[PDB]
Amino acid sequence: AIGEFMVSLPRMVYPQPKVLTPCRKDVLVVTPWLAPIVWEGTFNIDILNEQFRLQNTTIGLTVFAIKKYVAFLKLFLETAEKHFMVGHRVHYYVFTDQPAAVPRVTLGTGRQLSVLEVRAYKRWQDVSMRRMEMISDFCERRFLSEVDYLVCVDVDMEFRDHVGVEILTPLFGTLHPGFYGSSREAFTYERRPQSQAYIPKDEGDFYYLGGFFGGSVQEVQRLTRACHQAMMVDQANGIEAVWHDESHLNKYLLRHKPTKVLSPEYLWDQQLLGWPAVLRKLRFTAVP
Amino acid sequence: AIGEFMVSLPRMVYPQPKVLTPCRKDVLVVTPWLAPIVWEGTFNIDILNEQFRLQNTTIGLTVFAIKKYVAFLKLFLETAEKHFMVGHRVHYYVFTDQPAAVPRVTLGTGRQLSVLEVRAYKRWQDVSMRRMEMISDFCERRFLSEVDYLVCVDVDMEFRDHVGVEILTPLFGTLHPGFYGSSREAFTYERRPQSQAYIPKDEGDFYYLGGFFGGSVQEVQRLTRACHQAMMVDQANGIEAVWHDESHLNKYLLRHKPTKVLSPEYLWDQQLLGWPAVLRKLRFTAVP
Ligand SMILES: O=c1ccn([C@@H]2O[C@H](COP(=O)(O)OP(=O)(O)O[C@H]3O[C@H](CO)[C@@H](O)[C@H](O)[C@H]3O)[C@@H](O)[C@H]2O)c(=O)[nH]1
Ligand SMILES: O=c1ccn([C@@H]2O[C@H](COP(=O)(O)OP(=O)(O)O[C@H]3O[C@H](CO)[C@@H](O)[C@H](O)[C@H]3O)[C@@H](O)[C@H]2O)c(=O)[nH]1
Ligand SMILES: [Mn+2]
Ligand SMILES: [Mn+2]
Predict the structure, then answer these.
(1) Which residues on B lie below 8 Å from A18 (Cβ)?
(2) Does chain A have fewer CB atoms within 10 Å around its N or its C terminus?
(3) Do B33 and A14 touch (CB under 8 A)?
């Protein structure tokens, strides 16, 4: 459940947070609208695990594996079992055009997987851009009845380290690993005013990923519905945003500020970007 | 309103938050449970003003002025007009045993004041400790119908600088100005196991004030009800916590983590503690 009566935490022994010591001085850990930016060293996972277990939190994870991308499911799911929300209730929703190609993966207790068959689109960009519709339109009643939060990710990825309840909040985006140190003028936002995804050069907080976002079911429904509607407008106007769904997600999060922002620990490409000092953990990474 | 459909922010021009620059490196700006700690330089008030105005947020401010403390009302209210939630809807609730001693203070538009008459208790500690009852028991229906957030403060104080929507959240406490740099063993928590307010020497995050707390109406009701019940238990057991309501508030916030923590900018005593470098603003201060 979300927003139900919260029982008392039990006694816990852990290090005192010291006000005149930040652990992290090398990075911004809170946005100017007072949303935490989630980096290693900013959270005590034992406290968070307590808070979310006391709510009997259920997390839905959506992943699309259409056409050749079914090959990525085994590693995705097996590593999610090792690292994603372990100890909490998890419901995986695998959207595919090939139900029989979904690997038989052994799940820990309190975890379930549903295979949802969908149509395959011919163009790569329609496959990637139509996920907003599939999440909002077709699955709205399902998700509202079955989970408290939704986490929506790309499949060509593996978990290498803890991804847990520290991410959960009404609405979150993830800092793109290519651009976290860039100034806003260099962000690859949609720059044509004819697109609903247009962001002027003097606007923008961060460059967020299309590949890792989430929140409460209600907020994820809102985001995906708004992005779908905006993509339909662009289509009717004969324009396709430069980075597809990612461009629309950026416009949405500019105008609807996320209540947490995930650091690039949460979606990294080691082959392309290495392992910088400012990354203490690589949690979820692109498959080479 | 809280938690209603959030309209889009308008275009805004403001400095980009840079991920590899914290403004504040001298202080902890997020708790280990991912609640922001509110210091100057952590928030863009223009963004926050937008978000809360788009919700037509109404803030209730409670203040007790019993017996000789009515003398503090003029300065309290006049300075609140200059600095507290300016531009937002505000409802002051002044609890007093002397309605005719409440000064006639001129209010800005969209701001109102209600005088609530209460009984005066003979002991200083009963006056201070009975506010939990008065906030919860008698005023619950009133507040739920009239405001979105409640801010509950001591009266022997004045506003000197901005106190605004950056503080608003489901539940907040304020770091006591005497103890923000102390280790937890030095905190003046109730240490007798016979009191409901008991906190062992190896527990505790922060030392919070009895004099400045708040949150949503629902969360403030929960806090004040729980503290009132705990104080009644202690009374029945013939024990009175060392720092009265403040001791019980500390126990509650240990077991129910606040969703924001206010820095000591928000309740300071300059005569006793001066003006440290780590305080960029003194917002709300003790009257000498
Ligand atoms: O034939 C396809 C094509 C796409 N997908 C799904 O769509 C995702 C996105 O495609 P991908 O090839 O992973 O895109 P990338 O170029 O790796 O990532 C960019 O493009 C994605 C789609 O716009 C965004 O989610 C990312 O943030 C952005 O960095 C995939 O992981 C799959 O889950 C399929 O299942 N089958
Ligand atoms: O005769 C009284 C006594 C108390 N009060 C009210 O209660 C408040 C608390 O009393 P105060 O004398 O301000 O207590 P302090 O010793 O200044 O403050 C400590 O005691 C308060 C009561 O426990 C806590 O709120 C503070 O956090 C704590 O630092 C006052 O400001 C008034 O609002 C009255 O109106 N009349
Ligand atoms: Mn990918
Ligand atoms: Mn006082």
Answers:
(1) 28, 183
(2) C
(3) no
